[PDB]
Design a protein around this ligand. Structure first.
Ligand code: ADP
Ligand code: ADP
Ligand code: ADP
Lengths: 443, 248, 442, 442
C-alpha cells in the first residue's frame, strides 16, 4: 500500500499539554528527558523571538538522534521551514564551504508575503503590428507598437503594447484565438491554451482547450507566497524574469553557485524589513538540522562561531555520536563529540540514553505493526533477544526477510523457524567481523 | 519593471572615470591599446596577418583585427559561413564530415540514424507530453542603477539593457512586417536583421514559469468527483442519458 | 554480441519457494548466497519498503559481481539498475554527495501512463505556409482513409517533421499525437509523372481502411534523476547526455518530490523502486559513508547492495582500520551476505559452463588439467586460459582443445605467483622500490 | 627518411601456424614473448572476445613497447590501436575515470558501408518555370525546376522539386558553377566554378575547381570507418541548430564533459540494431597503456570494474617494476606495481633480457636501417660497450659515430670514431661515478 524506510512511525514528540512526555506516544519509546528538551526548544522556536540558539544531540548509535530531528520537524509542521543537512554537504567544488554554510543558514529563514498582481488575460482576437519608418536604421526596433484585442467573459479590451512585451508574447508563439495571460509585474506571459469557442478535433499539436476567463480583462488579485531569504538572494544574484537582455541571457547560462556578497544580503534584508513594516510580509524562522556534525573540519566550526552570533540566525540542531575524537583539520586538539570547545561553550548538549530489552521489544512491535506484519510472541521474544544481543538496527532490518520467507511458505504469521533461517541467511556486524578474523585470504 | 534594490552612484565617478572629457585620457588610452599597439593591425603587422591568413585560409586579412576588437555576442550573431580556399592549413575533421552530411538527411539512413540518437530518445520516451515539475520561487530583474542628474547614464543603461541588435536576435520579426520590409521597401533577405536565435523550449509547458490551476488537480482532490468521472467514461461509452441532482 | 565475463549468467536459478538449484541459469553452487539474493530480489520486487543496505562480502574470484549480475538479470526489464564502481564518485565537476545523490536518484523509477492518438492514412493535400525568413510556420494537412476524409492543422514541430522524410502527397504515413513521431509506411498512389531526382524505391503499401483516429494508452518509464535534470535548467535534455548537471539545487529536488507525490495521488504516475549496486565500496571516503548513513533514511531511496573483497583494512580519509573497509555505523544499518570459496566440483562446473559459453569444446582430461590448475592457482587464470588454448587449437588446425594446447597456454602465460617467483630471483633486472636497477648484463 | 628509436620492426615475424623464426621482421630473440603476442593477435583477429587484458613485464630495455608496436603492425592500419601513457589519465578538466572510459571507447571501430546516389557537374542552364495556373497574390508560382548538368563525356538536363530553388537561392548558384546533388534529400551545395570561366576577370576570390570526371549520374558504394568515441562526441554535442547556445559553444573552448552511460547505451543499441541489419560491422581493437605502474588505485579499481563490460577491447599493459608499492596506497607490496585483484584478471608475459649476439644483431640492424656503414671491429667494440653499460646506450651512440665519420670525410665508422664518441658522450654509470666523486654539487 505505502512505502516505509526506517522511519514514518514517528509522528511527533507525543507530549501532553503541560509538556510532560508520555511513555508510548507518537511512535516513541522512552527518551523522556530528551523528548521534554525537544519540546522545550519546540516552544522556543514557536516563540519566534530568538536567533542563534543551538542544541547538540549526543549519544551512541541507534539511540534516536535523527528520529528526534524528524520529530521536531513534524511537530513544527510544514509551515515552518526545515532544512535537513549532512556534514558532507558543505564541501562543494563550485564554491567555498563558508558560502555553502551561509546559504544553508539563509535557507532556513522563511517568509510569507501577500503579493498583489496585475493580470491582463483573455482570448486574443486581433494581432496587428505597426511597422517602423526606417527598419534598417541601426538603432530602434523593427516595429513601433502591437495592437492586441483581448476579450474575456463580459469584457473586451484593446491593448497597445511596446515592442518589449511583444518579444515575450511572440516568444510563446501565440496566435489568433489563443487565450493568454499577461502578468504585468514582470512582463512574463503564459500561453494558456486554445479556446473552445472554435473547433477542437482538428489539431495535431496535442493541444489543450480551456474556456473563456471569467471576470474582466484587467485584474488585481492577491496571491499568498511562501519564499525563503536564500531564494531572494539567488534571484538577485542571478537575475531572471525581466524583459531585458541579461534576463534572457541568465536562463541559458549553466547554473553555478557564486559567493554571494554581504552587501546583497544587507539590501535583501532592508527590502524585507520594509516589506514587513508595511504590514505585507511575515517572517517565519526555522530549523537547520546538521546530522553528523563531526564530519565538519575546523574552519566551518570557526565560521559557525560567527554565524551563530548573527542577528538573522536560525535555530541549529546538531547530532554527533563520538566520545572523545580529534577534530578534523587538526592533529592535537582532542574534543568531545568531535566538536571544538569554543563552539561547545555556545551549545546546549542534550543527552540521549540507550534502550533496555523491553523497549527493544516494543520498538520491534511498533515496527512490525507499521510494516504490516504479524509476528508470533515467541518470535517477538527472539527478536528482543536479537536487539539486546547484537544490535537494535539488525533486529529492525530482519523483519522483512522474515516476512518474505513466511510469504514464500504460504503463511502470514512469522515463527521462530523463520527467524532461525533468517539468521542462517543474513549476518550481522559481529559475526562478519568474527569470520573476518579467522580468514584465509582477506574475506 | 524595476528592481527594488537601488545602487546609488555619485556623478563624479561617472564623469571622471568612464566618460572621456578634456581632463582625462580614457579615449586616448583606448586608442593606444586597441588601435595603434594592436598586433593584428595590417599597417604595422602585415607579416603576422599574412601568416594567419595562410593558416586559417581567410579571404580577408583585416578579419583578425575585426574579431579581436568586437565583443563575443556580436561575433556570435553576425558569424557568416564564408567560403575558404582549399590551399590552406585548415582541415576537415572526421566529426565535421559526419556532421555536415547529416544536416538534411532523412530517416532510415545509416549516418542519419547513427547521428541522431538524442532525438530518438526524445520521441521514444514521450518528452513532448510531460508536465513541468519545478518552477522558481522568486524572480527578479537585474539591479537598477540611479545617478541623480545624468541623462547619459539613463541612455547608456537603456542601450545596454535593451540592445536592439540583441533583442532582434533573440526573437522573430512578424510575417506581415517581413512582407512590408521585403517587397514594399525593396530590402533583400540578406540584409534582414538576424532573428530567431532564442532556443526552443522542451515543451509548451516549459515555455514559461506561470502555472495555471490544474484541472486534473481540481478533479482528483475530491473523491466523489473522481468516482463520478470513473463511471462517466463507461456511461458515455454505453451511449446513455444521465441526470445528476445537486443541493448546492 | 561479444562474450564478456558475466555473459553466461542469465538469471538466479531459483524455484518458486526460493530454493536454488545446483546448476541453473548459469549459476552453480553458492546456495545460501543465492537464496539471500532471491530474498533481496523478492524484497525489491515487492516494493513495500525502501533503503536497505546489503553487503556482499567474500574473497576475490568468488562470484560477487556474478551474483549482482544475476540479481540484475532476474530483475527483468522496466526496473532501473545503476551499477557503479567506487572511483566514479570523485569528480572535478561534482561533489561526492552530489554524485551519490545522482546515483541514488537514477535507481528510483517513475512509470507514467499517457493517452496518445494514432493517425494513419493516405495523405491528399499538404499546404505549408512559411514566412520569408522561414521561421514562422503554419499550414493545413489533408489526410484520408477508405471511409473517412479529414483535414487538420499543423504546428511548427509537425511541419519540421514533415519536411524531413519527404512526403510526396500520396504516401501513407502514421502520426503519433503525443510522441510526435512521423513514420512514412510507404507509397500507395504509385505516381506516374515524377521528377527523376530522388532514388525513391518506396514499398507498395495499401491504403488503410477503417477509423482514421485511434485512441491508445501507453506507458513510459523515467527515473527521478532525469526529471531533476530536465527541470533543472532550460537545456537540460542536452545535459542528460553531456553530463553537465552541476550541483542541482535542493529546491528543485524537493519540488520534484512534491510533484511526483502529486502525480502518484492522481493515478497518473506510479513509483517503482530499483537497485543501486556499488562495486568496490571500500574505495570511498568517510564522507561518502556519512552521507549514505542519512540518505538511506529517506523515502525516495533504492535498495543498495555493495560488494567488498577487502579484509580488516584502513578506511579511506581516516587513520584506523575497520572490518570490510567500512565504519561501524554503516555496518550497523546493513545486513551481510558472506560468500564462500569453491571446491573442485564447483570450479569444474564453472569451467564447463564457460567453455560452453565460448562455444569451445574441451576434452575430459584437458578439463581435468584446467580444474587442477584452477585449484592450485586462481579460478580466473584457468578461465582465461581457455580462449588462448582454443586459439592454439585451431593454430594446430583441429577443432578440439587437447592437453598439449592447454599445456602450451600454461607455459606461455604466467600466474601471479609464478611471476612473483620469477621476479624474486632476478631483482637486479627489475626496478626496485628505491629505483636502483642493473641494465647492463655484465 | 626519419627514424626514431623504432621503425626497424615490421610486425612480429611468425611463420605459418607455428613458432617465431629467429631473425625476421626486425626482431631477434624473445621467442616465447613473440609467440604470446602472436596468439593474442590471432585472438583479436577472431573478433570474439571482449575485456581480455594482458600484461607483459620485464626489465628496462627489453622490448615491451617494441612488442606492442609489432602487435599494432600485425593487426593492420584498419583495426584501431590506441597508444597511451599511464600519466595521461590524470586530466584536470574531467575526472580520470571518464578519461579512461574515453580511451576504452576509442579502441572500438566500426565499418559502415553505404550506397550514395549522386549528381554532379557544371551548370549549363538553370531556370524554374511557372505553373500553367498561377496562383493569385504571389509572384513566380513554380511548378518544377529545370537544371542542366555537364561533366566529362556526360551532359544531362533534369526536372527538380520546386522547393530546391529556395536552397539554390540560399547557395548562390548561377550558370558556370559546379553543383553537388545528392538524390534523396535535395540539399544543393556549391563546389566552385569551372576552369573555362577562370580568366573572365582580373581580380576574383572564387576558386576554380576543374570539371568532374565520369558521368553526371553515378552510384558509388562508399565505406566509412568511425570509432565509437567519435559517435559519442558527435551525439553528445548539439547538431546543426539555430540556437545561440550552439554557436556560442562553437566559439568557446571545447571543454571535456562527463559522458553519461545513457548516451553510451543508446549508441550501442542503435549500433547493434544496424549490425543486425547487416550494414555496419563492429571491429574491436587494442588499447595499449605502457608504464601501467603509475596508475592511481582508483583508476585500477575502475579498470577492475570496466574489464567486465561487453564492449571492452583488449587492453595491453607494460611495466618494469618488481616488488613496488602501488601509487596512491602505502602498505601493499605488489608485483609490477599492479594490485593483485587486477593482477588476477590478466595474463603475465615475461620478456627475457638479451645476450652478446642479440646485441650484435640489434646494433647491426639499426646501423643498416640508419643507412650507416660500420666495421666489424667497431661492431664488436659496440657490442662490448652495450654489454658493459647499456643496450640503449649503444643504440644512442651510433649517429654520433656517423657524424664524426662524415666530419673526417669517411663513409665508414671506425674504432677511433667510436672511441671519440665514448669520450665525448657519457652513460649513466660514468655520470653517477662522476657525481659520487665530486664535492662541487655535480
Ligand atoms: N524512541 C524510539 N521509538 C521508536 N523508534 C526509535 C526510537 N529511538 C530510535 N528509534 C529507531 O532507531 C533507529 C536509529 O535512530 P536514528 O536517530 O535515525 O539514528 P541514531 O539513533 O543512530 O542517530 C531509527 O530507525 C529509529 O526508527
Ligand atoms: N556462482 C557463480 N556463477 C557464475 N559465475 C561465477 C560464480 N562464481 C564465480 N563466477 C565467475 O568468477 C568470476 C569472479 O566473480 P567476482 O564477482 O569477480 O567475485 P567477487 O565477489 O570477488 O567480485 C566472475 O567473472 C564470474 O563469472
Ligand atoms: N627483440 C628485439 N629485436 C630488435 N630490437 C629490439 C628488440 N627488443 C628491443 N629492441 C629495441 O630496443 C629499443 C628499446 O626497447 P624498448 O621497447 O624501449 O624497451 P622497454 O620495452 O623496456 O621500454 C627499441 O628501439 C627496440 O628497437
Amino acid at each position: 500500500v505505502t512505502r516505509t524506510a526506517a522511519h514514518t512511525h514517528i509522528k511527533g514528540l507525543g507530549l501532553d499539554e503541560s509538556g510532560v512526555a508520555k511513555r508510548v506516544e507518537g511512535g516513541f519509546v522512552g527518551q523522556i528527558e530528551a523528548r521534554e528538551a525537544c519540546g522545550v526548544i519546540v516552544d522556543l522556536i514557536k516563540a519566534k523571538k530568538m536567533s542563534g540558539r543551538a542544541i547538540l544531540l549526543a549519544g551512541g548509535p541507534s539511540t534516536g538522534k535523527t528520529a528526534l530531528a524528524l520529530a521536531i520537524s513534524q511537530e513544527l509542521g510544514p509551515k515552518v521551514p526545515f532544512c535537513p543537512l549532512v556534514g558532507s554537504e558543505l564541501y562543494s567544488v563550485e564554491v567555498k564551504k563558508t558560502e555553502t554554510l551561509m546559504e544553508n543558514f539563509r535557507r532556513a529563514i522563511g517568509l510569507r508575503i501577500k503579493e498583489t498582481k496585475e493580470v491582463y488575460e483573455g482570448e486574443v482576437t486581433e494581432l496587428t503590428p505597426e511597422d517602423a519608418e526606417n527598419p534598417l536604421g541601426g538603432y530602434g526596433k523593427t516595429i513601433s507598437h502591437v495592437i492586441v484585442g483581448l476579450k474575456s467573459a463580459k469584457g473586451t479590451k484593446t491593448l497597445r503594447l511596446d515592442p518589449t512585451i511583444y518579444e515575450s508574447i511572440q516568444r510563446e508563439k501565440v496566435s489568433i484565438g489563443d487565450v493568454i495571460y499577461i502578468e504585468a509585474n514582470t512582463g512574463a506571459v503564459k500561453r494558456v491554451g486554445r479556446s473552445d469557442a472554435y473547433a477542437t478535433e482538428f489539431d495535431l499539436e496535442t493541444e489543450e482547450y480551456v474556456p473563456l476567463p471569467k471576470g474582466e480583462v484587467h485584474k488585481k488579485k492577491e496571491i499568498v507566497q511562501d519564499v525563503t531569504l536564500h531564494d531572494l538572494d539567488v534571484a538577485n544574484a542571478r537575475p531572471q524574469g525581466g524583459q531585458d537582455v541579461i534576463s534572457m541571457m541568465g536562463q541559458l547560462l549553466k547554473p553555478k553557485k557564486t559567493e554571494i556578497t554581504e552587501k546583497l544580503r544587507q539590501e535583501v534584508n532592508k527590502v524585507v524589513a520594509k516589506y514587513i513594516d508595511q504590514g505585507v510580509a511575515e517572517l517565519i524562522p526555522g530549523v537547520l538540522f546538521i546530522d553528523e556534525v563531526n564530519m565538519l573540519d575546523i574552519e566551518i566550526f570557526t565560521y559557525l562561531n560567527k554565524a551563530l552570533e548573527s542577528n538573522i540566525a536560525p535555530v541549529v540542531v546538531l547530532a554527533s555520536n563520538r566520545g572523545m575524537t580529534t577534530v578534523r583539520g587538526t592533529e592535537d586538539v582532542i574534543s568531545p563529540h568531535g566538536v571544538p570547545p569554543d563552539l561547545i561553550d555556545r551549545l546546549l548538549i542534550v543527552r540521549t540514553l540507550p534502550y533496555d530489552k523491553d523497549e527493544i521489544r516494543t520498538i520491534i512491535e511498533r515496527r512490525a505493526t507499521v510494516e504490516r506484519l504479524q509476528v508470533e510472541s515467541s518470535a517477538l521474544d527472539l527478536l528482543a533477544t536479537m536487539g539486546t544481543e547484537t544490535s537494535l538496527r539488525y533486529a529492525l532490518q530482519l523483519l522483512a526477510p522474515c516476512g518474505i520467507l513466511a510469504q514464500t511458505s504460504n503463511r502470514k504469521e512469522i515463527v521462530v523457524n523463520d527467524v532461525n533461517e533468517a539468521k542462517l541467511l543474513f549476518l550481522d556486524a559481529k559475526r562478519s567481523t568474527k569470520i573476518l578474523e579467522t580468514s584465509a585470504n582477506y574475506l | 519593471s524595476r528592481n527594488p534594490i537601488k545602487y546609488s552612484l555619485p556623478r563624479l565617478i561617472y564623469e571622471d572615470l568612464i566618460l572621456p572629457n578634456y581632463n582625462n585620457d580614457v579615449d586616448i588610452a583606448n586608442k593606444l591599446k586597441n588601435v595603434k599597439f594592436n598586433i593584428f593591425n595590417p599597417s604595422t603587422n602585415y607579416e603576422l596577418c599574412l601568416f594567419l591568413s595562410k593558416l586559417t585560409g581567410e579571404p580577408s586579412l583585416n578579419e583578425f583585427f575585426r574579431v579581436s576588437t568586437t565583443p563575443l555576442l556580436k561575433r556570435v550573431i553576425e558569424r557568416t559561413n564564408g567560403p575558404k580556399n582549399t590551399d590552406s592549413l585548415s582541415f576537415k575533421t572526421i566529426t565535421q564530415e559526419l556532421l555536415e552530411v547529416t544536416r538534411n538527411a532523412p530517416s532510415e539512413g545509416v549516418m542519419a540514424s547513427l547521428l541522431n540518437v538524442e532525438k530518438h530518445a526524445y520521441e521514444r520516451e514521450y518528452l513532448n507530453c510531460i508536465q513541468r515539475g519545478y518552477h522558481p520561487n522568486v524572480s527578479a530583474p537585474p539591479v537598477t542603477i540611479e545617478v541623480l542628474g545624468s541623462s547619459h547614464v539613463t541612455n547608456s543603461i537603456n542601450n545596454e539593457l535593451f540592445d536592439p541588435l540583441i533583442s532582434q536576435a533573440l526573437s522573430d520579426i512578424p510575417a506581415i512586417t517581413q512582407y512590408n520590409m521585403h517587397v514594399k521597401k525593396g530590402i533583400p533577405v540578406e540584409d534582414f536583421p538576424k532573428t530567431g536565435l532564442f532556443p526552443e523550449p522542451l515543451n509548451k509547458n516549459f515555455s514559461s514559469n506561470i502555472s495555471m490551476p490544474s484541472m486534473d488537480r481540481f478533479i482528483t482532490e475530491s473523491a466523489k468527483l473522481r468516482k463520478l468521472d470513473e463511471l462517466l467514461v463507461k456511461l458515455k461509452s454505453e451511449g446513455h442519458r444521465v441526470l445528476i441532482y445537486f443541493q448546492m | 554480441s561479444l562474450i564478456a565475463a558475466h555473459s553466461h549468467i542469465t538469471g538466479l536459478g531459483l524455484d518458486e519457494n526460493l530454493q536454488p538449484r545446483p546448476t541453473s541459469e548459469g549459476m552453480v553452487g553458492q546456495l545460501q548466497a543465492r537464496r539471500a539474493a532471491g530474498v533481496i530480489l523478492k524484497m525489491v520486487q515487492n516494493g513495500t519498503i525502501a533503503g536497505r543496505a546489503v553487503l556482499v562480502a567474500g574473497p576475490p574470484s568468488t562470484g560477487k559481481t556474478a551474483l549482482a549480475m544475476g540479481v540484475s538479470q532476474s530483475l527483468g526489464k522496466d526496473v532501473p539498475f545503476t551499477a557503479i564502481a567506487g572511483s566514479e564518485i570523485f569528480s572535478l565537476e561534482l561533489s561526492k554527495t552530489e554524485a551519490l545523490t545522482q546515483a541514488f536518484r537514477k535507481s528510483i523509477g517513475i512509470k507514467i501512463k499517457e493517452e496518445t492518438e494514432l493517425i494513419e492514412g493516405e495523405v491528399v493535400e499538404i499546404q505549408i505556409d512559411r514566412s520569408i525568413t522561414g521561421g514562422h510556420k503554419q499550414g493545413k494537412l489533408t489526410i484520408k482513409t477508405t471511409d473517412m476524409e479529414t483535414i487538420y492543422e499543423l504546428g511548427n514541430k509537425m511541419i519540421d517533421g514533415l519536411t524531413k522524410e519527404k512526403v510526396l502527397a500520396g504516401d501513407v504515413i502514421s502520426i503519433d499525437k503525443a510522441s510526435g513521431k512521423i513514420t512514412k509506411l510507404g507509397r500507395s498512389f504509385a505516381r506516374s509523372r515524377d521528377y527523376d531526382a530522388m532514388g525513391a524505391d518506396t514499398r507498395f503499401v495499401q491504403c488503410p481502411e477503417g477509423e482514421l483516429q485511434k485512441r491508445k494508452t501507453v506507458v513510459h518509464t523515467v527515473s527521478l534523476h532525469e526529471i531533476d535534470v530536465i527541470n533543472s535548467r532550460t537545456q537540460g535534455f542536452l545535459a542528460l547526455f553531456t553530463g553537465d548537471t552541476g550541483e542541482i539545487r535542493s529546491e528543485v529536488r524537493d519540488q520534484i518530490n512534491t510533484k511526483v507525490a502529486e502525480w502518484k495521488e492522481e493515478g497518473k504516475a506510479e513509483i517503482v523502486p530499483g537497485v543501486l549496486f556499488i562495486d568496490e565500496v571500500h574505495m570511498l571516503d568517510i564522507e561518502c559513508f556519512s552521507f549514505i548513513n542519512r540518505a538511506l533514511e529517506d523515502e525516495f531511496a533504492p535498495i543498495v547492495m555493495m560488494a567488498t573483497n577487502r579484509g580488516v583494512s584502513k578506511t579511506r580519509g581516516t587513520n584506523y582500520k575497520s572490518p570490510h573497509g567500512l565504519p561501524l555505523d554503516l555496518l550497523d544499518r546493513s545486513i551481510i551476505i558472506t560468500t564462500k570459496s569453491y571446491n573442485e566440483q564447483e570450479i569444474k562446473t564453472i569451467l564447463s559452463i564457460r567453455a560452453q559459453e565460448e562455444e569451445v569444446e574441451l576434452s575430459s582430461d584437458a578439463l581435468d588439467l584446467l580444474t587442477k590448475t584452477g585449484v592450485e592457482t586462481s579460478l580466473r587464470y584457468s578461465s582465461n586460459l581457455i580462449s588462448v588454448a582454443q586459439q592454439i587449437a585451431m593454430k594446430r588446425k583441429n577443432n578440439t582443445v587437447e592437453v598439449e594446447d592447454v599445456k602450451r597456454a600454461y607455459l606461455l602465460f604466467l600466474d601471479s605467483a609464478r611471476s612473483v617467483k620469477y621476479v624474486q630471483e632476478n631483482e637486479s633486472q627489475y626496478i626496485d622500490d628505491q629505483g636502483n636497477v642493473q641494465i647492463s648484463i655484465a
